[PDB]
Amino acid sequence: MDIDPYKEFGATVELLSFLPSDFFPSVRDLLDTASALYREALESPEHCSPHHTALRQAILCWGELMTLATWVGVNLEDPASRDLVVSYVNTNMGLKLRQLLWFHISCLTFGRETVIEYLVSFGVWIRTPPAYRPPNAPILSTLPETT
Amino acid sequence: MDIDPYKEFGATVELLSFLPSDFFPSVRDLLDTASALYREALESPEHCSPHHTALRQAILCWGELMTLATWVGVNLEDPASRDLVVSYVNTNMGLKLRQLLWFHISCLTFGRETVIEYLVSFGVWIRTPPAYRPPNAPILSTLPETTVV
Amino acid sequence: MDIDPYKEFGATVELLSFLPSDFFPSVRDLLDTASALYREALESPEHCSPHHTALRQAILCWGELMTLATWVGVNLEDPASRDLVVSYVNTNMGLKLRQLLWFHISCLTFGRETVIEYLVSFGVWIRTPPAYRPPNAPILSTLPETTVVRR
Amino acid sequence: MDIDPYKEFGATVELLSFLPSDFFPSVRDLLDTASALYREALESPEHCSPHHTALRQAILCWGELMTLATWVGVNLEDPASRDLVVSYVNTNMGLKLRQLLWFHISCLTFGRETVIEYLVSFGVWIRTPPAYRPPNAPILSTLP
User: Its domain of life (chain C)?
Assistant: First the structure.
């Protein structure tokens, strides 16, 4: 019924596609980041933030797609069809999860607005000609500047 | 990460296992009900509650599987290998999502503590052997079966 | 009527004429920037500011030139002809749009006073011969020169 | 994206579609009216109203198409392809600026709201079957 997953949080699908698709880290680096930082809270019987609620659902959505990739690997007899189904899940469906996991993990770590301004800032930077922009790409950091 | 989806909301996967697998209505009837009632909140840019956030994720999860089910139909030329995947998505992967839509649609309606007491009460009814089991099961309602106005 | 696009906004064609062609992002990058940022304000039934009014007209102006560039591809037989027409639209006419889109997008994000002060200081830098000027052009950006968003 | 040009001002493309294409005056007649009445304001270094801003943009859009049409004449040797492009700009592309020039010149002259009821009133007239249709169409007039 035309739902935007980011609209609830103050973003859009268009705003996350304003960053290159290859910018977002892999699926496993994001799952290991959520499991390192957030695992105790994700497994809690508490809502915590709406980011936790959304992030719990995305991790479970991906687990069912990995069960699908496993199911395809065994059941389907011909390798030609197995590989087109597994490659679609890991790349095409993976990209939309990579954006969604990156978004909520970043909004938990760095704050939600910080991620929204970063996401506008980085996208303008990548479209600015190199001579007229700051030389180094934007990045998010929790490490305070020594002063 | 285990991540029981129901644990956040006061239930478990084992608590929703009191319901048979064939208890849950079709995904189509559940999406119709979410649209008929909750659409304008689900398209809304607020956090209305955690159930809304969970539906918004479950409805987009199902939308991606239908994009998959449509993508596989075009891009798999081998019919036998195509019909197995299109089925597995509509039936096997549908069941868990069809159980998850039922839960959050039932909690927005009827209240959440009523759905948890329904699962307990329905479990007593379904565990009862058929000889001793009453003819009418527990059911979620805001009104008695006969409404005189 | 001799009308200056920039003069109601506090600039001129001459003030923006010092920016080189390679300064501006492409048309696609500027359209996507206005869309990713200002789309709901650009599509709202309100006057948000004169920069919004001016973007709405520039965006639809480019939409007509792309309808032209598509019409030329379909209805012109001569391949040498359809190439000179499509290139003139994308290169020469698009360059004037890139300048116009960049200006209003920048004045929405940084404010018009900041953009005008940037254009004054950029001209001093660009008019200086290369030997006598700092090797890096002035930068107009939201980032504190080190990036590293923090907060 | 979408960007209805008229929705900012209280109209739409659906509402200006009540007017036929051949209703609108020529670009020349519209530019002569803007130059007569509005030129000192259009060339002013200030925002008079959003209709001035939008009308400045449309006059500059038409000027770039006339630079195009002048350019296409010189730099296209094949006359068969040359006149197709020139006749497309002066006719097909000019038609949509005719609508946009007409709309803002009318809202500066007669008022924004007056042009909105004129579009409604002209639609009632143009939809009336010919037998019952009054012989004179609605027209914008500042005479009280």
Answer: Viruses
